[PDB]
Write a protein that binds this ligand. Sequence first.
Ligand code: HEM
Ligand code: HEM
Lengths: 660, 663
Amino acid sequence: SKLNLEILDQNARDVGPVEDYAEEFQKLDLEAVKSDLEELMTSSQDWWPADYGHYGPLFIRMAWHSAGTYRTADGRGGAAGGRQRFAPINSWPDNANLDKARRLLLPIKQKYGQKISWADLMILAGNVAIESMGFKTFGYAGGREDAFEEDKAVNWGLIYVNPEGPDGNPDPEASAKNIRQTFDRAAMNDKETAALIAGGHTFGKVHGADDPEENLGPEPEAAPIEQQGLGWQMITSGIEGPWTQSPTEWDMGYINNLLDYEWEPEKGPGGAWQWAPKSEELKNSVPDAHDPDEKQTPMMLTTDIALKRDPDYREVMETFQENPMEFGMNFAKAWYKLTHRDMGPPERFLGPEVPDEEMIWQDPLPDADYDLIGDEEIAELKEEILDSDLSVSQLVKTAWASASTYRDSDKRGGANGARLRLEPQKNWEVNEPEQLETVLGTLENIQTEFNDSRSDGTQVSLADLIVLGGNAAVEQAAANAGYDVEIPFEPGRVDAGPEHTDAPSFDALKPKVDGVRNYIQDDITRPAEEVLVDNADLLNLTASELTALIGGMRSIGANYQDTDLGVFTDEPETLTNDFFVNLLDMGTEWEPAADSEHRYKGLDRDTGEVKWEATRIDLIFGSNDRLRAISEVYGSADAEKKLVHDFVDTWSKVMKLDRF
Amino acid sequence: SKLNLEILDQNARDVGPVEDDYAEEFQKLDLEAVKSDLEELMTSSQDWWPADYGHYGPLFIRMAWHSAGTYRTADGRGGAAGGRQRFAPINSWPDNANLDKARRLLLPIKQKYGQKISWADLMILAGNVAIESMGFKTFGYAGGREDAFEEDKAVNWGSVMGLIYVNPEGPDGNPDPEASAKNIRQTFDRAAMNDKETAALIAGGHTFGKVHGADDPEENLGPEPEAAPIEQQGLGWQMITSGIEGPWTQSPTEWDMGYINNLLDYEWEPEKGPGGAWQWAPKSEELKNSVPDAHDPDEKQTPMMLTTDIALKRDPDYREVMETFQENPMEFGMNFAKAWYKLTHRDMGPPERFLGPEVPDEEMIWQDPLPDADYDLIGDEEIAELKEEILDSDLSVSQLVKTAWASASTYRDSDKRGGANGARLRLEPQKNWEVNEPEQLETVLGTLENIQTEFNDSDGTQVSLADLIVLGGNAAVEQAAANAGYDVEIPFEPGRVDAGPEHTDAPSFDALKPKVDGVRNYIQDDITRPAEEVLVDNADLLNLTASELTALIGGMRSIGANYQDTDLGVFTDEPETLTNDFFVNLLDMGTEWEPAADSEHRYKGLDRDTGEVKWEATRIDLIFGSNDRLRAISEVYGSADAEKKLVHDFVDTWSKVMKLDRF
Ligand code: HEM
Ligand code: HEM
């Protein structure tokens, strides 16, 4: 049970041989990569013969699996850093043979080098595969910075479900429920699901030419060195056969065979259950994928049937079949979201194939119909935010609630936009609704008064003012300790309306733990310090920064319900290193509080009286070894100025996490 | 069995909130004022862990001795130069029980002076001070140990798991002194300690303190620090420590002949102690109650001996030594003064790294001292001059590169030993290592020594051989780069001197002899480890990332400086020409690899169509195309727009390695 500190470690450097990609990509002749991709598609390599002489259907699987592992909970997984290339995901059994898929794209990758990431490439192969099979995508954009290693944070072997039926049972009624929930926790809803599953299986076949548990070598990570990174030494799933009769053209095909004919539960030529027709008019309808003098009968899966059996999915399909323009429209649109969902907002969609239309899931931001504030206005605004009935605590705490939502996995959240004042942020437990309203109130009136007073068209947003009071507040506390710090500040944030906000999607940013505010929700099954570190990672913090941050915060005192937990000082709202001096002091001894979920009491070792209250968040800086080593530097007689500066650089950094 | 690259990752950044120099900050310490504070600490019993004999010294000594005891010659990791006793798993080794308390006790001194003394430097000074305030003078002290901020992820911990040295009860838990005796010698050997130094150290340690085992530790103690509830703030094992009870001497807080008189002059008997452990007790009732109780007036305890003690008495070799000691106090003091000093400084590297007022003027042989350059240094003019001269000679580029790697590759940042400043390459054992191919090397050292002689003979300026090995290679590489149409000028630091045999303890450099060098694609027929893993281990000792390793190996194969000049991994038809040709090739799928039948280390790379062998290789080469992280790195460099990058990266690694020992 030791803190997986390594994940924070990741944020102190970047591994790999690179000292911005956006700039490089901006130089790439996209059209030519799409060209060479077209080519590649019918350009069969002997070491892994192409099905029907078209690689596209495969490449679709390589794109779909690259993005399919996304999760809204943490914005992790997905295809943003091209992490399909690395263990353990690269050896998921659901990703069998997809080593070859990525290998075909190596010449290309090699030709363009730094101008296209594996990341942007894999999704482009997906696009091109499709475009040149009768369809046409709703758009494409690059911008996916290539990662150089696994995601050490993820707590994960399948993209969604078992294709045989849950637990390996051909019970389609039942598999649906598994489909229904994966896709939910994926963000797709009933209609987006069937579009993608059907859009998807209108192409290619399955591969179960013989049983895998006996015909397939180690998966990439256990394979012998000589296999140069490939593995599973034609078989992938264990299930054999195509869906459509035209496995390489966009069309009703799947929705046709699925809905017109009836299907029986059979055992395939690789052991796993599949389905075939009781109907005999599809028998040898499809050309063999390889032998040109050969025919093959279509198959379906439990997973496919479950579309046709679930009350709801079934109707989505009837619609689609009774109307194919809608089939396309939905599937065009779902594909684009499935593949781009985790790249953040418009500012980060690059290239000349980005739609002109902006998607709700980009959590887009309006424009500044005014001239930005200048330094003269800045000091002016900063004086007046301190002159208000608002304390340090209050401003800090607000400035944190506005910025703390930024997560780096999907680039969602942040202070810019000021979505804190909106649903569902203005009404989060941890945000203290009635308290939050006050602060918002008070700052709105500064905007009001600031703007009205201008005879030059300059304006300030609330989103700026939230952060600005925050910086101001933090400067005040540092002046209350004898230091003279000026934080760097960036005007330009804007205020987003509800209309351009998908409120229910923002629920996934709800912190079940918040270290700066010593907030710990009742439920939590993980230990607090675990989720602390995990979040610490969404903000891209190193152990050291997480350490100064929380430590300096406790000197200032900005807690949920204004409690005194970890507030090991008797001069709150003064910025010092008292947290560490007192946490490190052996004069004081710690013990759990009885009849209390999160609380501990710090007693005088002698007297045996109460001296401090705290929680695991505060105490962890004193228990785990590495964190302590950091605490000990900060506690030291001369660490104080250093902790202030370190606090400042930290806070100021988080303030700006989403200034993409 | 996934290659553990995590060890190389640590070499990219440094964790901790310390901006990237400790030395200029140590030169700011008032060593005498800290020693004052430590003095007083010796006798200020805190209630959470009240001093034995009302003097902490002994706890402190065993804390410093454990900080330093974990030191390995084989690879130079462990030791007390990072202070790493402070982090898991080490601080939770059962052998380190209650040293949580000892360390904790130094916290306020640490906090008082802060950045001006590492935990590492401090834990050793606490031992030097404990020892002096009990009537013994130390040989000297030196600061300069950089504090670390996490464990050494490189070390493989495996005479037992988490025992500094041996089982204090005896081998496999039997009270067999003679058997213990051998296990003392072995472990102590693989520590660079001999019979005298071992005897001295064990005998002057146990001159102080006691072994606490009031009850059985199996279930009277809580979990070790790592498994302890959070409220304990990093203490653990909630008086019992090792489970063995008693002091060794009648004045456990004074330096005297007490251990050796007690051990040598009386008969001891094995028995099971209060804590369930094997200890020995004396037959004669003269020693009964001759010792005050650790915490009392009105009571006396009887001395004990451990089995590991009885061992210096039973083995005839330690016995010879022990007897010498008893008979000459002064002799046994010095051996102990010098064994202690060497023990706690051995891994700080050469003499320039030892800082402070109490560094002895004498330098020991195990410091690997470097003579002084008693002559003027080479200037930009003579550098370039001599460079041409080298390039003039009939030495190939694979000669100048290979030699110069041979010279610098022996540095290991774990204990600061090795490197190419001293041309120890030309001295024993180095010029006789197989991997260096002696006869071949000797040719190269022939030419360079003549250039050396030519230049010196022909204003009091001079050039070390050690400088020329490096200068050679730097121009070697400059050329391989000019062959690919790159003009890159390697920076060169003149200065390195030539160590003699009188500055080199030859048998101790065996510990630097590579098993599986990768720049030269060398791999001994011994290794149990798969070769790539040792590759990574060695890399770590050069302080390389996954990237810098990859940059280096790859640019290397385009130059072909292989042991025995084989072809293995040399994927280019333009040898001695520095290019991304390793990766372009290696990555091409037109080639297909498989093992070379009936060969140990060898692989065939084939045309996938003809079956015609296109190249040969080892796991060294092939790993940069199998492992998922390294393959990602080789893809960048094999990209069509990234030759110039590799070239400079390879240079930049090359230059960093040549200079590693430049302290
Ligand atoms: C519950 C959801 C899904 C399940 C259980 C599922 C299951 C499977 C399985 C087991 C394979 C076999 C791979 C093989 O043996 O060759 C397969 C192939 C395939 N899947 Fe899915 N799939 C799902 C959703 C999707 C989606 C969302 C897409 C993309 C829009 C997609 C596209 C494809 C394609 C094109 C192939 C055939 C690849 C080829 O022709 O070689 N599938 N599917
Ligand atoms: C063969 C190697 C050695 C063994 C097996 C050994 C064994 C032990 C054991 C079992 C303890 C009991 C710890 C406890 O229960 O509190 C102990 C204590 C101690 N050891 Fe060692 N020792 C060895 C060598 C050394 C050396 C080389 C030194 C210093 C040079 C040293 C210094 C000490 C001191 C001072 C104590 C007592 C500390 C105190 O009284 O608080 N030992 N030793």
